[PDB]
Symmetry: C2
Subunit: 197 residues, 2 copies
Amino acid sequence: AIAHELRTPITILQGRLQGIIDGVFKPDEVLFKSLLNQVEVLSHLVEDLRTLSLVENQQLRLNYELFDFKAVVEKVLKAFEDRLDQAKLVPELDLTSTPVYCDRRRIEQVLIALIDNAIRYSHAGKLKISSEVVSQNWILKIEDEGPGIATEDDLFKPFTGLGLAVVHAIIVALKGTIQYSNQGSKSIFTIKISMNN
Amino acid sequence: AIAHELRTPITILQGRLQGIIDGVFKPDEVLFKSLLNQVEVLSHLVEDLRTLSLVENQQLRLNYELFDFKAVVEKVLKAFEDRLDQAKLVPELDLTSTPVYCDRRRIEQVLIALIDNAIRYSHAGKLKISSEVVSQNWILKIEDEGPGIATEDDLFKPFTGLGLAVVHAIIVALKGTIQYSNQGSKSIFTIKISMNN
C-alpha cells in the first residue's frame, strides 16, 4: 500500500532540475512553466490522497444543504471552458429545475474530477450532463461519445490520476452508488444518491 | 488521516517557481540547487510514507540474515561523515564483535534515520553507538550530549520528517521494541530486538 505511483513525478522532476544543473537545459520561461506544472500535478495527487485517506477512516466532514445543481454545473463548466473547447467537447445539459439536498463542495469535487477525466479521455463531441429526481432518488448521468473501458472493474481503482477513485470514495461517503456503462458508442457514468435519509 | 503536512513543501515550491515567473527571483545555480533540495525533501517524505503504509498492512517484506553490525555502522557513518563534522558530532563506538541475525537493510534504514535526527537535533559533542547481545537479545543504544523531549509520547508520532515514526514502524515489524530516555544531560534511544525467534 498504496501509493508510490507518485514517486515518479518526483524523480522526473529531480532529473529535470538536475538537467538544468548539469548543463543540458537552458532555463527559459517554458522550463519554469513545466516545473510549476509538474509541482501542480504532485499537488493534485497529494490532495486526492488526502481525500481518500479521510474517507477510509470516516473522518470526511460533510455539510448537507439544499442547493441548485445547475449553478454548480455552470460554475464547473466555466472553470473548464477553454479546456473544453480545446478538446472540442460541447456540453449538453438536461438538468432539472428542482434543487437537491446534498453536500455542495463534494458534489462539485466529483463533477470537477469527472469532467476532467472527460476532457482528458473522451472523444470530441457532445457531453451529456443529465440530472433527474425520481422519488427521493437523485440520478446524475455523464455521457460522452468517446470510448470506454472493459475489464473483469479496475476503473475506480487508484492510478490528476486516481480521480475516479476519489469520485467513488466521495460517492460512498454520500448516501449513493455509482455505476459505469460502456456501450461501445457511448460511455456513461451514473450516480444515484438517495435523498430520503 | 494523515498526512497533508507534506502539502506545504509543495506550496512553498509552487510559489518559489512562481517567484521566478513573476520576476522576483533570478534563476542562478543556487536557485536550482534549492529547488532540487526541496524536491528531495518531498521524495524523502513520500518514501517514508510508503514505508509506513507498507508496515501498517503487514506487507513489508523482510529478509533475515546473519551480518556484522559494525560494518553497517561504518557504512552509515561514512555516508554522513561531512555532515557529522559540520555538526561537530564525533561518533563513539562500543560495538560488539559477535554478528546479529536480523534484516540488514531495515536496520540500516533505522540507523540512517536515527543519526540523521542526531545530526539535525543533537548538540555538538560525543555520539555514543553501543551494541550488546544479552542472551538472545540484541540491545542497540544511540546516546547524545544534546537535549531531549518531555511530553505526556508524541516522539514516534508522524511529523526528512517523521523519521522516528519510520524507525518505530520498522522496529515493530522486527521482533523488537524501542524506548526513549531524556536525563537532561543525555538523550538515549534504545532498541531491543529478540534473536531467539
